[PDB]
UniProtKB/Swiss-Prot annotation, chain B:
GO terms for molecular function: double-stranded RNA binding; GTP binding; GTPase activity; metal ion binding; structural constituent of cytoskeleton. It comes from Mus musculus. The lineage of its organism: Eukaryota, Metazoa, Chordata, Craniata, Vertebrata. This is Tubulin beta-4B chain. The keyword Nucleotide-binding applies. Dimer of alpha and beta chains. A typical microtubule is a hollow water-filled tube with an outer diameter of 25 nm and an inner diameter of 15 nM. Alpha-beta heterodimers associate head-to-tail to form protofilaments running lengthwise along the microtubule wall with the beta-tubulin subunit facing the microtubule plus end conferring a structural polarity. Microtubules usually have 13 protofilaments but different protofilament numbers can be found in some organisms and specialized cells. Component of sperm flagellar doublet microtubules. SMART domains: Tubulin, Tubulin_C.
UniProtKB/Swiss-Prot annotation, chain C:
It comes from Mus musculus (Mouse). It is an enzyme of class 3 (hydrolase). Mg(2+) binds at E63. The modification 3'-nitrotyrosine is found at Y274. Ubiquitously expressed, although primarily in lung and brain. This is Tubulin alpha-1A chain. The gene is Tuba1a. Its EC number is 3.6.5.-.
UniProtKB/Swiss-Prot annotation, chain D:
This is Cilia- and flagella-associated protein 161. Keywords: Cell projection, Cilium, Cytoplasm, Cytoskeleton, Flagellum. It holds the Pfam family CFAP161. One of its GO terms (biological process) is flagellated sperm motility. The gene is Cfap161. InterPro entries: CF161, MIR_dom_sf. Gene3D superfamilies: 2.80.10.50. It comes from the Eukaryota. Microtubule inner protein component of sperm flagellar doublet microtubules. Microtubule inner protein (MIP) part of the dynein-decorated doublet microtubules (DMTs) in cilia axoneme, which is required for motile cilia beating. GO terms for cellular component: axonemal A tubule inner sheath; axonemal microtubule; sperm flagellum. The keyword Cytoplasm applies.
UniProtKB/Swiss-Prot annotation, chain E:
Belongs to the MNS1 family. The lineage of its organism: Eukaryota, Metazoa, Chordata, Craniata, Vertebrata. High expression in testis. Expressed in pachytene spermatocytes and post-meiotic spermatids. Signal peptide: none annotated. Microtubule inner protein (MIP) part of the dynein-decorated doublet microtubules (DMTs) in cilia axoneme, which is required for motile cilia beating. May play a role in the control of meiotic division and germ cell differentiation through regulation of pairing and recombination during meiosis. Required for sperm flagella assembly. May play a role in the assembly and function of the outer dynein arm-docking complex (ODA-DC). ODA-DC mediates outer dynein arms (ODA) binding onto the axonemal doublet microtubules. Disulfide bonds: none annotated. This is Meiosis-specific nuclear structural protein 1. The chain holds residues 51 to 99 of 491 of the full protein. It is found in: Nucleus; Cytoplasm, Cytoskeleton, Flagellum axoneme; Cytoplasm, Cytoskeleton, Cilium axoneme. Disruption phenotype: MNS1-deficient mice display situs inversus and hydrocephalus. They are sterile, exhibit a sharp reduction in sperm production, and remnant spermatozoa are immotile with abnormal short tails. Able to form oligomers. Microtubule inner protein component of sperm flagellar doublet microtubules. Interacts with ODAD1. Interacts with BBOF1.
Length: 98, 427, 432, 251, 49, 33
């Protein structure tokens, strides 16, 4: 009969597991979620606060200590203003220790 | 200096707070194993705002994580951040509501409210000093709009003193996703007015613009779009968590933004956006950030802001900056076009400062606005509403589990009188 | 723990559930002898101490040749010894025998095993009936069960995939009586009645898949894939999953509207799939062409009311919004005034697993629309028309009166159809 | 409408920059060695070290003899692991039983109140079982404590057995005979190598067991559960669950 | 269980894909070029000779 | 021509070329084997 014709068993029609797992990240995109909003140049530690920089830190170290040179094209006294100091490690003050 | 209690519900909100509770984990240097491996001793300062403690030095959030379906709760703790969320802070049923507001607000989403009400007072009484309640959900279904906007009526029964802030998702204008949206959109807007203070309106047609026209990708999806909303969240409360020049908070924001008992509907933004090709060709300074945060193309709602006026405008800033270049460019933009502000208020733009941007940005901002072209989002619902009520279509999902027509015909007389307030002050 | 206790009634029900449960045992690791990551096979497959999964649905036929052929086929060790129910006599193309005598003699073991399944479950959503309008076992036993179950288990979802008789061509002589009577007795106890035909699938199996001279066994797997992309949301994960309540609450506006039309979009063979480009737009514009409906009706004579796009596979969710947005800008696709949203989308990501050496290929994007239309009243007009020509002669009625039921059901089963078409005409107009 | 990766159509340029930066970051990670592949292969190579046991000059076991711990195939329920399970360190560390028979370095136990590094072992007498992770070079120890309300095994909730660095008296085991009318005659006899002997603790007097009925999916895929609970029948002799054999290498 | 397993698994997938495909393609191309060129060179020169 | 070949490999290549025939033959036998 045609039932005994068509319903011969199939040993070895293993279903795939891979297209579902890849459509998951087609929708999601797992490492992509900082490649969406990161900007400019990659950088791990960039961050420090204003009291600690201006007061306790005593300001930038490798910059020009006295000279403020007036440039040619753009009309500006930059080499003090242009730095916007970012020297050294961030604000550490001894709380991770405690 | 407070803590923050943050509520999440719906199939939406646990796919939005999944991105929210990991930027906060990024900015405080929180690894997904629970501990802290940040770099400074600045991040560890106000860790209490979002992170209770236990033994071993690990920090677990204040997360409330509720949904009728167990469909998405299998997906949020199967992410990278799975051992950072709380185990007994997943509250669920077995059935799913799915697009109706009867069995969210009265029966099937309702018996679990006593399983959300008695988890809040386990934690929100153990917090020493709270600023208020936050919520993120979608109005478009039956578990955010069914349970959360029910609970928004419930938790404001206890504490009237604190401040309700909301991260709502109104339905999109053009292409919608459900035939029964202008009921669940209609009934929860009339819910929101009495019991919420700064209601933020977010769309996905206005965000599928930004990942296309501005940031220039070719496959914008949800995970690409959930993160710009989750950039806004930590860009809001930047001064209760970090020092700066002029600190603001969620009670400083409400005084300078909402004048009125009823004129309290908002519109958000987020400033520094560009492509991935022009990453080094731009200069992230103040004359670039201010130039785009006021523009219509950089806005997270269905607002053309030129067609009306802003009564008020808020802001925040971050990053080691100076103040004169943020003193005059929000003074020029009030001056260069008086057409897009109303005359009877003397100032409009509030300025707030911090010291630190999100990790990777250099300087940041977050635009928050009380425009009166947000009434172009509540005209299309009331156009869609009464052009459905006139044929009385679909109303036997809405008499079948406990509501009447009198919960209906008064749920537009709040939407009419809202727009009847916003049109008085348009010119 | 979200099971779907399904019912298969009649020769039609067992002969389509052969291929349906073929696909359910195909897509998992389920062997055809009980034995065997994901644990979403516990929504159709129980356990024991030997790993042996046994399917949780009921098959009824009073004409036991098909059931004994199943019992002696290759699928003997897998089905339960008891949820396959036989008689020794058929209802034999009448409503009286199936509804009053042969239904009454054996409805109780069906209801016993339904109660055993329903109290061995934990998380049943509703009831899914596969039956036949045009026969004896699939109509009388069907309406007897759908009274005897809606009196007990009350308000719950009821979706009926129904093998409707063909518009022109036919198989048995007196199908108008046995269509009209069971329609009148199903309309008060239905929730959603999905409708399919046979020559309307023969047309598509000739003109799309290019195979000529097909069988019932080559027609059955297209319904066996339609039901699987219907139920796929519980079956695997996704982005916006679908419970059983949203069809029944998104598709029917009124008490007596509930007759949607089914259609299944990406129909093509193996030698042609590798050279055609499976775009989302081309799939969704094939699915609206009236040469691609499973029901032989023309939608241009009426208005749609509500749709349900249910996806499967590698959906790009922006492109679905773009596709609906370019559907909505056409005048050849018309809508009524009162539904301005008029759509629903459900999502799953798993690609459609296709039987080995079939007439279909490994599609990566499956679309099922289950939309309702007011151009099914035209289909009901013909089986009232045939009844009008037949009853005037009082032909064939003695077979009906000679097993208990009166002749006075024949007037009310036409008054019901007249009021139903009155409903369908008064709903689809404009109000001004 | 939509094309492939490389053809110069449409929005290709910003995506070219995108996979350029992702491809370069992935190459930086592979060059540094922070990728899951090379970390995982290094870990598994340092676990599955093909190393050598010690043959026995007689039938008997001495101290210092590098000796496998294995449980014989049994002929109660229909969940079952096929035959000769062995005791293996399964980290995440943990302890379980795996379908293996070769010494591979997470199998290999060194027999450690006795004194001499070579000394014949007897029934009813305390000893310790030692194992070492790769490059740590410090002796781990087989332990199990009296059951509390917070310290229970993984799948079954009986007394659990684990590995610890420290030294105590909750590390000493003693091995006896299964035939219960002869152990008081066997209290001082030397123990032959490959014979079926019960293992019990000295502080709890419970015994180490293998649960062939619940499975532990690991990275290696080989499955069982270990615990300590003494089992007896209705005839009150010890079941085949508790029999253990301390096999040595062939000559 | 599923979460951790599949996460690590697909991370593996992506990385492998990338590195393997790039390296293999590059090697194939350059090597084929070199072989064909040199073979042609020697054979033509010798035939001419 | 740039190919370093063993003596036994050259004898086998000549045998395979003579079996292939009732340069092209030598290059084809070296490519196949």
């Amino acid at each position: 009969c045609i039932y005994r014709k068509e319903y011969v068993p199939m040993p070895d029609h293993r279903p795939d597991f891979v297209s579902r797992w890849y459509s998951k990240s087609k929708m999601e995109g797992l490492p992509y979620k900082h490649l969406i909003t990161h900007h400019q140049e990659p950088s791990h530690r960039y961050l420090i606060s204003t009291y600690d920089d201006h007061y306790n830190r005593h300001n930038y170290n490798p910059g020009l200590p006295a000279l403020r040179t007036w440039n040619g094209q753009k009309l500006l006294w930059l080499p003090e203003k242009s730095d916007f100091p970012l020297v050294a490690p961030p604000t550490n003050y001894g709380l991770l220790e405690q | 200096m407070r803590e923050i209690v943050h509520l999440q519900a719906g199939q939406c909100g646990n796919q939005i707070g999944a991105k929210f509770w990991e930027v906060i984990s990024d900015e405080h240097g929180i690894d997904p194993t629970g501990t802290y491996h940040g770099d400074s001793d600045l991040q560890l300062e106000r860790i209490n705002v979002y992170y209770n403690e236990a033994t071993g030095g690990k920090y677990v959030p204040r997360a409330v994580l509720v949904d009728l379906e167990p469909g998405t709760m299998d997906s949020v703790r199967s992410g990278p951040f799975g051992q950072i969320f709380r185990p007994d802070n997943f509250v669920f049923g077995q059935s799913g509501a799915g697009n109706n507001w009867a069995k969210g607000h009265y029966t099937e989403g309702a018996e679990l409210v006593d399983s959300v009400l008695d988890v809040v007072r386990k934690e929100a009484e153990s917090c020493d000093c709270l600023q208020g309640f936050q919520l993120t959900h979608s109005l478009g279904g039956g578990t955010g709009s069914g349970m959360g906007t029910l609970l928004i009526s419930k938790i404001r029964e206890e504490y009237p003193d604190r401040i309700m802030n909301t991260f709502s998702v109104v339905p999109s204008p053009k292409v919608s996703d459900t035939v029964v949206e202008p009921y669940n959109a209609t009934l929860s807007v009339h819910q929101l007015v009495e019991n919420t203070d700064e209601t933020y309106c977010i769309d996905n047609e206005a965000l599928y613009d930004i990942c296309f026209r501005t940031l220039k990708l070719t496959t914008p999806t949800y995970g690409d779009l959930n993160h710009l909303v989750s950039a806004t969240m930590s860009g809001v409360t930047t001064c209760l968590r970090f020092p700066g020049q002029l600190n603001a908070d969620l009670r400083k924001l409400a005084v300078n933004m909402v004048p009125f008992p009823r004129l309290h509907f908002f519109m958000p933004g987020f400033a520094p956006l560009t492509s991935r090709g022009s990453q080094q060709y731009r200069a992230l300074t103040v004359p670039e950030l201010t130039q785009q945060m006021f523009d219509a193309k950089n806005m997270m709602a269905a607002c053309d802001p030129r067609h009306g006026r802003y009564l008020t405008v808020a802001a925040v800033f971050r990053g080691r900056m100076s103040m004169k270049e943020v003193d005059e460019q929000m003074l020029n933009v009030q001056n260069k076009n008086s057409s897009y502000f109303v005359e009877w208020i003397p100032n409009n733009v509030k300025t707030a400062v911090c010291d630190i941007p999100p990790r990777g940005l250099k300087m940041s901002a977050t635009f928050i606005g009380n425009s009166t072209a947000i009434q172009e989002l509540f005209k299309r619902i009331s156009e869609q509403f009464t052009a459905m009520f006139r044929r009385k279509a679909f109303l036997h999902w809405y008499t079948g589990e406990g509501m009447d027509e009198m919960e209906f015909t008064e749920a537009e007389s709040n939407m009419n009188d809202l727009v009847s307030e916003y049109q008085q002050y348009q010119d | 723990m979200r099971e779907c206790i399904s019912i298969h009634v009649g020769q039609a029900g067992v002969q389509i559930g052969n291929a349906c449960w073929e696909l359910y045992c195909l897509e998992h690791g389920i062997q055809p002898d009980g034995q065997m990551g994901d644990d979403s096979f516990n929504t159709f497959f129980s356990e024991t101490g030997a790993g042996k999964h046994v399917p949780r649905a009921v098959f009824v036929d009073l004409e036991p040749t098909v059931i004994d052929e199943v019992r002696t086929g290759t699928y003997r060790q897998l089905f339960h010894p008891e949820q396959l129910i036989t008689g020794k006599e058929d209802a034999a193309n009448n409503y009286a025998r199936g509804h009053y005598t042969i239904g009454k003699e054996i409805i109780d073991l069906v209801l016993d095993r339904i109660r055993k399944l329903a109290d061995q479950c934990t998380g049943l959503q509703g009831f899914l009936v596969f039956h036949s309008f045009g026969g004896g076992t699939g109509s009388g036993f069907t309406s007897l069960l759908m009274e005897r179950l809606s009196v007990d288990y009350g308000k719950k979802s009821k979706l009926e995939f129904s093998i409707y008789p063909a518009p022109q061509v036919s198989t048995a002589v007196v199908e108008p009586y046995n269509s009209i009577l069971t329609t009148h007795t199903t309309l008060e106890h239905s929730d959603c009645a999905f409708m399919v035909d046979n020559e309307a699938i023969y047309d598509i199996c000739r003109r799309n898949l290019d195979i000529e001279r097909p069988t019932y066994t080559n027609l059955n797997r297209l319904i066996g894939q339609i039901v699987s992309s219907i139920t796929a949301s519980l079956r695997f994960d996704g982005a916006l999953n679908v419970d059983l309540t949203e069809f029944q609450t998104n598709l029917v506006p009124y008490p007596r509207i509930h007759f949607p039309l089914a259609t299944y979009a990406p129909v093509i063979s193996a030698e042609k799939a590798y050279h055609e480009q499976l775009s989302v737009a081309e799939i969704t514009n094939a699915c609206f062409e009236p040469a691609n409906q499973m029901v032989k009706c023309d939608p241009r004579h009426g208005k749609y009311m509500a749709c349900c796009l249910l996806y499967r596979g590698d959906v790009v969710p922006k492109d679905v919004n773009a596709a609906i947005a370019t559907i909505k800008t056409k005048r050849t696709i018309q809508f009524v005034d009162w539904c301005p949203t008029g759509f629903k989308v459900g999502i799953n990501y798993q690609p459609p697993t296709v039987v080995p050496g079939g007439d279909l290929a490994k599609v990566q994007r499956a679309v099922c629309m289950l939309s309702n239309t007011t151009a099914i009243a035209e289909a009901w007009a013909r089986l009232d028309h045939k009844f009008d020509l037949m009853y005037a002669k009082r032909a064939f009625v003695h077979w009906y009166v000679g097993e208990g039921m009166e002749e006075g059901e024949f007037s009310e089963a036409r008054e019901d159809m007249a009021a139903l078409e009155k409903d369908y005409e008064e709903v689809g107009v404009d109000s001004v | 409408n939509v094309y492939g990766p490389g053809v110069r159509m449409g929005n290709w340029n910003e995506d070219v920059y995108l996979e350029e930066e992702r491809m370069r970051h992935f190459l930086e990670k592979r060059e540094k060695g922070e990728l899951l592949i090379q970390r995982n292969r290094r870990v598994k190579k340092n676990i599955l070290r093909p190393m050598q046991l010690s043959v026995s000059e007689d039938g008997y076991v001495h101290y210092g003899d590098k000796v496998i711990i294995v449980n014989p195939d049994q002929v109660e329920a229909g969940k079952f692991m096929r035959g000769d399970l062995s005791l293996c360190m399964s980290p995440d560390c943990g302890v379980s039983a795996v379908q293996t028979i070769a010494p591979m370095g997470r199998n290999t136990f060194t027999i450690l109140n006795s004194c001499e590094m070579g000394q014949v072992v007897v029934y009813g007498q305390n000893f310790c079982l030692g194992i070492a992770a790769g490059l740590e070079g410090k002796m781990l120890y087989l332990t199990s404590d009296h059951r509390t309300l917070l310290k229970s095994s993984l799948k079954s909730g009986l007394q659990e057995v684990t590995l610890t660095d420290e030294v105590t008296h909750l590390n000493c085991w003693q091995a006896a005979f299964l035939d219960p009318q002869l152990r008081l005659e066997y209290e001082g006899f030397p123990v032959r190598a490959n014979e079926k002997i019960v293992i019990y603790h000295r502080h709890t007097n419970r015994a180490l067991a293998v649960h062939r009925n619940l499975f532990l999916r690991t990275y290696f895929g080989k499955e069982m559960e270990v615990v300590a609970h003494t089992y007896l029948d209705s005839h009150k002799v010890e079941k085949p669950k508790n029999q253990w054999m301390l096999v040595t290498g062939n000559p | 269980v599923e979460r951790q397993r599949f996460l690590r698994v697909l991370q593996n997938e992506q990385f492998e894909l990338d590195m393997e495909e790039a390296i293999q393609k590059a090697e194939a191309n350059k090597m084929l070029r070199d072989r064909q060129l040199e073979q042609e060179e020697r054979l033509a020169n010798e035939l001419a000779r | 021509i740039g190919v370093k070949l063993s003596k036994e490999e050259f004898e086998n290549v000549w045998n395979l070329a003579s079996k292939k025939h009732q340069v092209e033959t030598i290059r084809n036998v070296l490519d196949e084997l």
